[PDB]
Amino acid sequence: QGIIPLPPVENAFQEKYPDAKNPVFEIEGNYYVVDFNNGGSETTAWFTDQGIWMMEKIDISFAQLPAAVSTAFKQSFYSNWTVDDTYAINRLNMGIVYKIEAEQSNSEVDLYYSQYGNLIKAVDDEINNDAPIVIPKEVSNLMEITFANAELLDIQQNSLGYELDMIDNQIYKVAQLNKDYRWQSTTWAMSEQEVPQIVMQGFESSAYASDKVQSIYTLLNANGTFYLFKVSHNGQDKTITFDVFGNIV
Amino acid sequence: QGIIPLPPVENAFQEKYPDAKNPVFEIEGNYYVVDFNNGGSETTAWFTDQGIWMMEKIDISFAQLPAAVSTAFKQSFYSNWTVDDTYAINRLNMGIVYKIEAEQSNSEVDLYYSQYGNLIKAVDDEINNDAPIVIPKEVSNLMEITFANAELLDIQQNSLGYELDMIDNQIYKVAQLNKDYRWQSTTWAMSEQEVPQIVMQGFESSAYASDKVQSIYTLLNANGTFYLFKVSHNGQDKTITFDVFGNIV
Numbered sequence A, B: 001q002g003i004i005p006l007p008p009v010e011n012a013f014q015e016k017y018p019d020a021k022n023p024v025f026e027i028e029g030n031y032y033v034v035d036f037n038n039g040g041s042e043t044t045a046w047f048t049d050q051g052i053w054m055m056e057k058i059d060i061s062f063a064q065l066p067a068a069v070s071t072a073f074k075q076s077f078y079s080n081w082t083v084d085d086t087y088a089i090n091r092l093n094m095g096i097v098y099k100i101e102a103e104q105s106n107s108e109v110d111l112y113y114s115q116y117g118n119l120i121k122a123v124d125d126e127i128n129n130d131a132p133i134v135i136p137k138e139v140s141n142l143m144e145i146t147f148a149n150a151e152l153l154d155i156q157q158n159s160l161g162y163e164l165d166m167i168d169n170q171i172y173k174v175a176q177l178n179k180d181y182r183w184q185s186t187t188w189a190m191s192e193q194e195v196p197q198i199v200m201q202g203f204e205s206s207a208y209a210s211d212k213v214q215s216i217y218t219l220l221n222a223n224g225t226f227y228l229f230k231v232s233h234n235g236q237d238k239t240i241t242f243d244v245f246g247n248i249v
């Protein structure tokens, strides 16, 4: 069953997955897609016409998730929902992404996580919603110049343009690009211990020093570098922005 | 001290405040402004050149606030800040607004509340930032036709147009107008008892039934009437919108 793959596809497939069993190929969009058993795990892999491997999706159990991911889920808005399926997704030149499919009553959500438990996105479940992501030349050029060591996890389209989700020395960084892929901003959560001394002293000498710290983000944009302290009091949240001298802006 | 008011301003002032002591007039923008002792509290009143009364700002103590307002402050993000000043503000053809000025370290905030303790707005304190609000014909017409029972409390400009804050039959409502003052939406908070039964049954049979309800708001716009349930779990918030049929949209 399924179709006969082109020889370069068959060759790339057999070279990458020598232990594959019961492979079944089909054409979906611009890719040769193969469902198969690999070391007892149901796997799907995507290849281009020329046999270039682009992605794999592996069926895993909840117990096979890294601790950081299972903990992220357990601490999430959806922790009480029933987990239906869990997957590991590897795309060409991208870091690993874990997918948890969860349901409750008449709703079903697809949760995508970094290996460190960073929620990349949450979407309504739909069948066949996971496919290859071609990295545009503009994005590879930007990564080489500005984020040389980082590893992309996802490229998402939004109204303002594109979002790059990446891991940079285990930091989950989100960069916004406009519709022409021109960089606009980068933001990430940091630990209080990592905030520069001058900024941290500003915060500790400010009105907000006694408030509960919910999170701290660095924000980089055309205007410079900023530190966003999200603090709370009586269950109300406020985000206070500090500049590089530790002054409130 | 100060300047001599035009005779129509002087007469309007004496007629409206017969017991005023130590009045001092100045001109500020398009208005004659007078500072005076009114029955033991400092008060400021604004008049047009023609002597039309536009506003008064009355110095009050925290104890003179309606209970709802002082309670709103004590439950706010700023409950721990030091109260520097409190005022009651009455503007022509508008309902009463209470202002609380609070400070901590080198920050100061101005909190404006309805008589029921609804936060109208919160802004960084700035000297003499309270001034008359000329109600445009478009807004007066809209209040007469569409919100005939309501008292307007504030008109606030925003990027999408204008925001009208009002009290309509003891419900605090916020209406959004576009830049031509054309109505876009109206929203207000409600209790579960006030929500239509079909909508509550929809929520109670949905995936979000077991989550904690933080608030429920009705939203009216060109496309219909909606119910926004802001719920939480593991400290994470999500707003679920239901239509008049009790279905999630």
Ligand SMILES: [Ca+2]
Pocket: A202, A245, A246, A247
């Ligand atoms: Ca400083």
Ligand SMILES: [Ca+2]
Pocket: B202, B245, B246, B247
């Ligand atoms: Ca229904």
Ligand SMILES: [Cl-]
Pocket: A076, A077, A078, A119, B236
């Ligand atoms: Cl979440």
Ligand SMILES: [Cl-]
Pocket: A186, A220
């Ligand atoms: Cl960076």
Ligand SMILES: [Cl-]
Pocket: A196, A197, A198, A199
């Ligand atoms: Cl420093």
Ligand SMILES: [Cl-]
Pocket: A205, A206, A207, A208, B104, B105, B106, B107
């Ligand atoms: Cl401060």
Ligand SMILES: [Cl-]
Pocket: A212, A232, A233, A234, A235, A236
């Ligand atoms: Cl809190």
Ligand SMILES: [Cl-]
Pocket: B186
């Ligand atoms: Cl209404």
Ligand SMILES: [Cl-]
Pocket: B212, B232, B233, B234, B235, B236
């Ligand atoms: Cl919660």
